[PDB]
Design an enzyme around this catalytic site. Structure first.
Site, PDB file in Angstrom:
ATOM      1  N   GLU A 123     -12.725   1.763  -9.793  1.00 27.03           N
ATOM      2  CA  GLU A 123     -12.985   1.515  -8.384  1.00 27.03           C
ATOM      3  C   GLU A 123     -13.002   0.012  -8.149  1.00 27.03           C
ATOM      4  OE1 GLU A 123     -13.223   3.610  -5.922  1.00 27.03           O
ATOM      5  OE2 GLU A 123     -14.131   2.464  -4.285  1.00 27.03           O
ATOM      6  N   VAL A 124     -12.287  -0.435  -7.121  1.00 34.07           N
ATOM      7  CA  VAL A 124     -12.101  -1.854  -6.850  1.00 34.07           C
ATOM      8  C   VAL A 124     -12.648  -2.179  -5.468  1.00 34.07           C
ATOM      9  CG1 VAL A 124      -9.743  -1.413  -6.055  1.00 34.07           C
ATOM     10  CG2 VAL A 124     -10.452  -3.732  -6.651  1.00 34.07           C
TER      11      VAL A 124
ATOM     12  N   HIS B 278      -8.023  -4.836   0.706  1.00 37.03           N
ATOM     13  CA  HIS B 278      -8.245  -3.801  -0.298  1.00 37.03           C
ATOM     14  C   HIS B 278      -6.928  -3.180  -0.736  1.00 37.03           C
ATOM     15  CE1 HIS B 278     -10.224   0.248  -1.537  1.00 37.03           C
ATOM     16  NE2 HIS B 278     -10.232  -0.601  -2.548  1.00 37.03           N
TER      17      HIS B 278
ATOM     18  N   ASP C 259      -9.600   5.368  -6.080  1.00 40.29           N
ATOM     19  CA  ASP C 259      -8.486   4.512  -5.681  1.00 40.29           C
ATOM     20  C   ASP C 259      -7.309   4.645  -6.640  1.00 40.29           C
ATOM     21  OD1 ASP C 259      -9.034   2.419  -3.304  1.00 40.29           O
ATOM     22  OD2 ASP C 259     -10.940   2.868  -4.300  1.00 40.29           O
TER      23      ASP C 259
ATOM     24  N   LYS D 132     -20.823   0.550  -6.658  1.00 36.59           N
ATOM     25  CA  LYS D 132     -19.781   1.448  -7.146  1.00 36.59           C
ATOM     26  C   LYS D 132     -20.249   2.215  -8.375  1.00 36.59           C
ATOM     27  CE  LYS D 132     -17.081   0.417  -3.865  1.00 36.59           C
ATOM     28  NZ  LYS D 132     -16.548   1.489  -2.983  1.00 36.59           N
TER      29      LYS D 132
ATOM     30  N   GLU E 137      -3.746   8.609  -3.189  1.00 36.33           N
ATOM     31  CA  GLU E 137      -4.912   8.837  -4.030  1.00 36.33           C
ATOM     32  C   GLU E 137      -5.160  10.329  -4.200  1.00 36.33           C
ATOM     33  OE1 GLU E 137      -5.060   6.579  -1.497  1.00 36.33           O
ATOM     34  OE2 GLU E 137      -5.981   7.612   0.208  1.00 36.33           O
TER      35      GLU E 137
END
Lengths: 48, 216, 145, 91, 124, 434, 49, 49, 39, 96, 48
Positions: free
Chosen positions: B110-111, B36, B97, B124, B54
């Protein structure tokens, strides 16, 4: 005669039985320790 | 990155079948964190936004010039579409993120890295877009009432990359796909390795149960 | 009095474990009497908690929780009966036996109220076994003072 | 402590009072082959008189290191007397 | 003393029941690693399974039971993961365990007995 | 109430079980406030009643001395036994502690000198264990502790309960053998929970409890009084005299074995739960009469705990045992749900194995070894409430001391060893020590 | 040692008696059944010797 | 002070006699033995059942 | 042998040299590259 | 014969002409010398007859190269793990 | 000096399972013939 250890019986090669033309493989019975159950017509439980 | 190097150094000295289930689980968690992180870094360098730490949604809005009084007033409101009925204050507490501010437009992304792209995307979405759209309506109403000179535009984009990185270029037509997919291919090998090698054969069921509870 | 103990009251209520399967607990598979189903002759059948649990497990497709079991049997009418043979168990106290949905509802109410009441047990409710004497001793001390 | 008190007594001109007895009904300080112990000795040994065990009698320091780290000397403050804090030359 | 059996088929069928199955924890990647190992090292298209010993065939079926139930449904993804693990780092072809019931030595010796191979190739 | 209810009800599960029930509820009556002398009188009366009902007492047919070359006191309790123990040992040590003491004495006698009267007791215990290892293994789990016991017939139809005749007995036995983790934890999913409940329903103790106030119980009493086939010797129904004769035949030709010695020591050795050594405490205790008038104080209820849990094991022993025995995915899920600290299960299992290896040569890695040794090592942690008079502290030692001072109804009693003589010891206690 | 031989002989007696009651391959089964560490054919040879 | 005092009491022997009578009645209570007549006597023929 | 291993530890034993000769006899070009001294 | 068989096995399975033995760890070199001690003294003087006997034994009937015992102080597992650690081999080839 | 050292060692001696096992093994197996001869001598009656 009593005091017969059917559980101690081991199968090395193929074991075959014939009954009215029906072929039966008794090796799994020996491996499962159910020799006495089939010996004297006694109930047991086996996987399908 | 260096985290992958440390993980590899720690795991090349472990003989096969000599790791307890909990050790395998936390090593796997570290490896997913590393994957991630490296995807976050590729997006970081793609957008050239050196936001190493973040920031919360409230902090991001503060960087966008949003006054604090209206944010404090909105903190008392409740999301009507939230599945768990979480308050806006907690939704402001959490940190996405990555983020970017371009005039009156703010982009939130958002990943996640997983095999099931659709499931991660929808998770998500249900986690972010409800609160994001509620904030969008709140700021639109504030603009209509006249507390801000210019309305704000919010955009949410979720992208899920498969474990093999086949569709990473399709979703992210970046120049740096090759190095990232090579690095992510390695993490898969490492994860699979400890998962099906350094693990003890007497605790494979324990590992499976812990993995199912933690991730499924 | 209860407003000064909101955190502990919430913790006690949430610690009742409303999410565990209903039939995995000991209290729901015990030998305590329980009314069965209406027979052909029209008389409610005297049965046992374990038998009714087995019946529901056989009919159902999963082991539901307390809330799920209540939701499934919400429309079921409550029924009650007087035991055929009295007592029959060291844990059998009373003279009435109800049905499974009735037991579920009474269990919900009892668990919620026990959770909300165990916190004030130091002053008002004399909880037997461990701290039964303390509340009455405090009351008597206040009275004598 | 016995060695230190013996040295002090020698400097003062007297010596420890030693009595050889086969047994003492009370707690006395006696010396055995393994060393000095407190209790009731039932074995003929040497018992030191005028020894009373008083259980009722029951911070920053700096340490100077010598012998490459084999003996240690400590004191309360800069003006405090130097005493051997610790040493590894034991058996 | 003396017992006679006249209905052995019904006798066995009375014993038939479900739920007493000894399930084993399968490793989806490891199963296909050993599958590739066996396919590469051993030629299984030499001796017909029909003429094989039922005693050894039963053992082979038992040790292979439930292997594909986790990899037949999902094959390409598992193969890709195994390829990534085997290329990104070295993996011992013997320390890998497909399932808890698997026994290495016994598996190899049974395979060699069922499928004899020339030892000159392994030695010379 | 308990003293008078100890008489009418017949458990009908056999000599050992009826005697254990009577003694246990006499102990409970002692806990509720009964004097030790009244409790002793009740124990004697119930023991006499059960001995006459089963014929164990000397003077009638079922006396063990007429069929065993061993003293009446030295015969195991499951056979013709003397259940005339002191109420102190029953309340403090346990119910099946007589068998444990007998086995300890037999092993001590076998050492030093190799006689035959003690190897006879060893053979009797081995015969009892052989009889015990022919039924459900979860019977030994929980309830009263025993090395082994004789199984007695159940004189009630299985069709009385609606769902008893859903799974056959052989089905239940093979399911229990296959799924041993469910002996220690309760299944969660319905597929296993239904079988668990059906097996629970066919339990003889639960069947008797369900038929406790029914006329069907007179059948067993009349069969026992008439000395009919009520016990098991192999796959056949046999009379108690036949069981005694078989025990004598097996014990007269029994040869000691190193593994059998290790297992007997496993029975004799310490427990997984911290247990106080009541035997040496009572042997080394002394009571003195102080000429002081009796003073009647109030009554307070204190928690008398005899078996605790080692703090080093973060999870309950049943949870760790089930986790070790669990091989299926759903068994693992159930044991993870039951366990409060799932991440420390492996550590607890490793410490368990290390402690067993340290105190015993037995290795729990083999499933058979742990399967055989787990019920004799893990015991339940049931807690009790005992009514005490004055300032008795909430410790087992204090409750026991209060019971010692309560032996005399009129005279004040002082205990000479007034210091703390607690012996909280476990398998891992010695490990922590070294 | 006598006890083990007695047990093997009793097992052989029982299996042959049942095989005669039914229709079974006596010689084939005696070359397949195993007791302790000795096959049934070896057990019969030892009994003869 | 309790058993020694009550041993010589008439109630002790009366209770033992009632116990023997109840034992006989329970013995007769069997399903086979219920529908047939019976006779018993106790205490030197003084009490007849 | 233990004395030789303790004192030098930089010269391979004659056993390793003999094993290298054996490997050379079996298949050359796959032998251990030996540059240390003997004993 | 087992000595020459295991030597050939080691020769074919592992590439021993890659890493210099001078720079090898002395701790592992000691164990290798211990497990190979005395092998040369039995086969160099008479090799051709021994090699022919080994061929004869291995060609006619199958020999599993995990049961060959060169001497009474040999463990297959330890020797093979030592040789793997001293001489790394690309595992990708075995599985690919 | 040896006697004094023996007294010092023996006064503080603590029982050990290994030592107890060794002593049991000696007195029950090793010296068995000697004790047999002792019991022979003890259990003999001689009349004049």
């Amino acid at each position: 005669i009593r005091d017969i250890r059917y559980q101690a019986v081991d199968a090395v090669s193929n074991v075959w039985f014939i009954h009215k033309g029906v072929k039966l493989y008794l090796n799994p019975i020996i491996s499962s320790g159910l020799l006495e159950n089939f010996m004297k017509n006694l109930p047991a439980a086996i996987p399908p | 990155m260096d985290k992958y190097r440390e993980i590899h150094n720690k795991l090349k000295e472990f003989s096969p079948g000599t790791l307890t289930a909990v050790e395998c689980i936390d090593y796997l968690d570290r490896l997913y964190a590393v994957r991630h992180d490296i995807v976050d870094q590729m997006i970081k360098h793609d957008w050239s936004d050196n936001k190493d730490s973040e920031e919360a949604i409230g902090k991001v809005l503060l960087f966008a010039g949003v006054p604090s009084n209206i944010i404090t007033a909105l903190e008392k409101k409740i999301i009507p579409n939230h599945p768990t009925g979480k308050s806006l204050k907690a939704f402001f507490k959490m940190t996405p993120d990555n983020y970017k501010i371009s005039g009156t437009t703010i982009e939130f992304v958002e990943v996640t890295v997983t095999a099931d792209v659709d499931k991660g995307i929808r998770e998500k979405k249900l986690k972010y877009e409800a609160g994001l759209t509620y904030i969008e309506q709140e700021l639109h109403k504030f603009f209509l009432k006249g507390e801000i000179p210019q309305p704000y535009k919010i955009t949410f984009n979720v992208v899920a990359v498969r474990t093999d990185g086949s569709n990473i270029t399709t979703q992210w037509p970046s120049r740096r796909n090759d190095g990232v997919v090579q690095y992510m291919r390695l993490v898969q090998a490492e994860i699979s390795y400890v998962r099906e090698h350094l693990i003890k054969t007497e605790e494979r069921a324990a590992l499976e149960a812990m993995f199912n509870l933690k991730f499924n | 009095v209860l407003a000064t103990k909101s955190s502990v009251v919430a913790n006690s209520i949430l610690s009742k474990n409303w999410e565990e399967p209903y039939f995995s607990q000991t209290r729901n598979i015990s030998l305590k009497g329980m009314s069965g189903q209406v027979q052909e002759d029209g008389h409610l059948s005297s049965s046992v908690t374990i038998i009714e649990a087995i019946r529901y497990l056989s009919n159902s497709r999963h082991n539901p929780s307390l809330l799920k079991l209540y939701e499934e049997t919400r429309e079921q009418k409550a029924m009650a009966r007087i035991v055929r043979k009295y007592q029959r168990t060291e844990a059998d106290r009373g003279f009435f036996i109800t049905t499974l949905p009735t037991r579920c509802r009474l269990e919900i109410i009892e668990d919620y109220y026990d959770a909300i009441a165990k916190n004030i047990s130091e002053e008002y409710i004399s909880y037997g076994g461990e701290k039964k004497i303390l509340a009455i001793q405090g009351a008597l001390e206040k009275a004598l003072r | 402590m016995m060695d230190e008190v013996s040295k002090e007594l020698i400097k003062c001109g007297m010596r420890f009072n030693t009595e050889q007895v086969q047994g003492v009904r009370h707690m006395v300080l006696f010396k055995t082959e393994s060393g000095f112990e407190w209790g009731k000795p039932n074995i003929p040994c040497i018992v030191y008189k005028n020894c009373v065990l008083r259980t009722s009698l029951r911070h920053k320091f700096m340490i100077t290191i010598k012998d490459d780290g084999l003996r240690a000397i400590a004191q309360h403050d800069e003006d405090s007397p130097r005493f051997l804090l610790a040493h590894a030359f034991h058996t | 003393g003396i017992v006679k059996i006249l209905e052995p088929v019904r006798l066995i069928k009375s014993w038939v029941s479900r739920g007493l199955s000894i399930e084993k924890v399968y490793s989806p990647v490891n199963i296909i690693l050993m599958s590739r190992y066996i396919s590469k090292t051993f030629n299984l298209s030499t001796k017909q399974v029909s003429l094989l010993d039922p005693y050894d065939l039963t053992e082979l079926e038992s040790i292979v039971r439930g292997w594909g139930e986790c990899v037949i449904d999902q094959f390409e993804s598992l193969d890709r993961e195994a390829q990534n693990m085997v290329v990104n780092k070295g993996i011992c072809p013997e320390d890998v365990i497909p399932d808890s019931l698997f026994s290495f030595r016994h598996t190899m010796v049974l395979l060699r007995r069922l499928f004899p191979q020339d030892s000159i190739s392994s030695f010379y | 109430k308990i003293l008078l209810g100890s008489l009418s009800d017949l458990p009908g599960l056999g000599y050992f079980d009826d005697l254990a029930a009577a003694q246990s509820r006499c102990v409970k009556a002692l806990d509720l406030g009964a004097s030790p002398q009244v409790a002793q009188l009740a124990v004697a009366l119930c023991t006499s009643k059960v001995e006459r009902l089963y014929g164990t007492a000397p003077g009638m047919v079922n006396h063990p001395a007429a069929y065993l070359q061993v003293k009446h006191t030295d015969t195991p309790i499951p056979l013709g036994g003397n259940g005339a123990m002191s109420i102190m040992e029953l309340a403090t040590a346990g119910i099946g502690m007589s068998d444990k003491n007998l086995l300890k004495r037999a092993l001590l006698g076998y050492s030093h000198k190799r006689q035959k009267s003690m190897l006879y007791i060893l053979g009797l215990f081995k015969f009892l264990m052989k009889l015990s290892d022919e039924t459900f293994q979860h019977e030994r789990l929980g309830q009263f502790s025993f090395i082994g016991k004789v199984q007695w017939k159940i004189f009630t139809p299985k069709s009385e309960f609606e769902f008893a005749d859903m799974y056959t007995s052989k089905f239940l036995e093979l399911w229990s053998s296959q799924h041993v983790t469910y002996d220690y934890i309760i299944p969660k999913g319905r597929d296993n929970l239904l079988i668990y409940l059906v097996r629970k329903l066919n339990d003889p103790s639960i069947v008797t409890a369900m038929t406790m106030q029914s006329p069907l119980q007179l059948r067993f009493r009349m069969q026992a009084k008439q000395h009919m086939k009520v016990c098991r010797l192999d796959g056949e129904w046999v009379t108690f005299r036949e069981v005694l004769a078989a025990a004598n035949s097996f014990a007269e030709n029994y040869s000691a074995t190193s593994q059998d010695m290790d297992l007997f020591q496993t029975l004799t050795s310490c427990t997984f739960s911290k247990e106080y050594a009541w035997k040496d405490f009572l042997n080394g205790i002394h009571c003195d009469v102080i000429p002081t008038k009796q003073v009647q104080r109030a009554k307070v209820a204190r928690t008398f705990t005899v078996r605790e849990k080692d703090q080093i094991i973060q999870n309950s022993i049943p949870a760790v045992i089930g986790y070790k025995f669990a091989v299926t995915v759903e068994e693992m899920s159930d044991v993870l749900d039951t366990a409060k600290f799932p991440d420390s299960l492996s550590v607890d299992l490793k410490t368990m194995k290390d402690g067993v290896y340290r105190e015993l040569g037995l290795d729990i890695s083999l499933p058979d070894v742990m399967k055989r040794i787990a019920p004799m090592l893990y015991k339940s942690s049931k807690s009790r409430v005992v009514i005490v008079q004055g300032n008795v502290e909430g410790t087992a030692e204090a409750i026991c001391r209060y019971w010692l001072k309560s032996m005399s109804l009129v005279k004040t009693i002082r205990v000479k060893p007034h210091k703390e003589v607690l012996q909280a010891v476990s398998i891992f206690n010695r490990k922590e020590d070294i | 040692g006598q006890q083990k031989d007695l047990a093997a002989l009793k097992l052989c007696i029982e299996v042959w008696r049942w095989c005669k009651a039914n229709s079974a391959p006596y010689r084939d089964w005696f070359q397949a059944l195993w007791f302790e560490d000795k096959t049934f054919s070896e057990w019969l040879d030892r009994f003869c010797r | 002070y309790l058993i020694d005092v009550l041993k010589k009491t008439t109630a002790w022997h009366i209770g033992h006699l009632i116990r023997d009578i109840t034992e006989s009645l329970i013995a007769h209570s069997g399903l086979k033995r219920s529908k047939y007549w019976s006779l018993h006597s106790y205490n030197n023929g003084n009490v007849i059942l | 042998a233990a004395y030789s291993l303790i004192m030098n530890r930089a010269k391979i034993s004659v056993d390793l040299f003999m094993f290298n000769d054996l490997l050379k006899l079996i298949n050359p070009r796959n032998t251990l590259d030996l540059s240390g001294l003997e004993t």
